[PDB]
Amino acid sequence: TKPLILASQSPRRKELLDLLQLPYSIIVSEVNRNFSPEENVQWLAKQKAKAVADLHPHAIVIGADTMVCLDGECLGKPQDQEEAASMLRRLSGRSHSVITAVSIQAENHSETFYDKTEVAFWSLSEEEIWTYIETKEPMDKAGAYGIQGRGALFVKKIDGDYYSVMGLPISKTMRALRHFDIR
Amino acid sequence: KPLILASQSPRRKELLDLLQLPYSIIVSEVEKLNRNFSPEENVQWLAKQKAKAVADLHPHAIVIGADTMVCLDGECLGKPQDQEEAASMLRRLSGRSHSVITAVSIQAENHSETFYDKTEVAFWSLSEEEIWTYIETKEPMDKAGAYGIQGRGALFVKKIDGDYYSVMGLPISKTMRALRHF
């Protein structure tokens, strides 16, 4: 048996991993154009898990990364408030992909995968964009929106995993951890 | 006009709270869904009856009523009566898809609007151990179809095609949009 480590500072990933009712600890570590968004998100989840697994080689380390992509271009956490409003205008009245990769690392076993969810947005007004920006909820999230909180009002529907949109495909994470014998 | 949520559902309360609008919770018990009607007709009839019953008591108000059904192969599943029935319902939902239909009815003296939102829910194949341990925490017993998308029930869901909030009992983005019409 090996102790479980969540290599993430994300409160959403913490809340989702708590659903497993498995004891674990949290450690956050210090974080290519030729790659596709699918390769990039998998690579980043891997680097996050490996940085902590290198420091604690006796444990099972979970790393994850979430990207918001549309027409091949991915949107990261917006630096400015105007950039956050620009991302929202691009997302308005259409569909985009939310890609979440998970990497599970142990000395004798490693597993990396991504989950893709299609997210459809209603057509949004300028007023709704800035009043949502004022809440401070967009700044912390990729693509300048969260499916929870006030961001829930922009979402018309999804085709995929809501928990994966939050930052962790918890049902798949649970299934992958069974082959690490959970502990 | 003042806003009334004709539901005691904590999930519908937490969702209607996202709107940042003042409202009160008022309920009046209504029940029998006829087999001659489709589940889509019935769920809308139920959301209507719940809102109308409270609207008759508060005719100056805007009243929101809602109802949620979990259906597969035209058959809809209610809250389980016993743990053996809850395991029967989950065994049926395992390894396949079902529909979650939520109807919302907004009632006022000069305007009324009813609609349903349909979501496809796909489950992983479930073991007998998984079903009984989930039953052993009493989360199924309170819910239609013997499961919830939140909590330990989250681990059974493979994917959805629709609205997660509608599965919780309220399509919050459609409701918000419909309240602008009022």
Residue numbers in the entry:
A (entry chain B): 2 to 32, 37 to 188
B (entry chain A): 3 to 32, 34 to 185
From the paper:
Maf (for multicopy associated filamentation) proteins represent a large family of conserved proteins implicated in cell division arrest but whose biochemical activity remains unknown. Here, we show that the prokaryotic and eukaryotic Maf proteins exhibit nucleotide pyrophosphatase activity against 5-methyl-UTP, pseudo-UTP, 5-methyl-CTP, and 7-methyl-GTP, which represent the most abundant modified bases in all organisms, as well as against canonical nucleotides dTTP, UTP, and CTP.
In BSU28050, the pyrophosphate-like molecule is coordinated by the side chains of conserved Ser9 (2.7 Å), Arg14 (2.8 Å and 2.9 Å), and Lys53 (3.0 Å), and its position is similar to that expected for the β-γ-pyrophosphate part of a nucleoside triphosphate substrate.
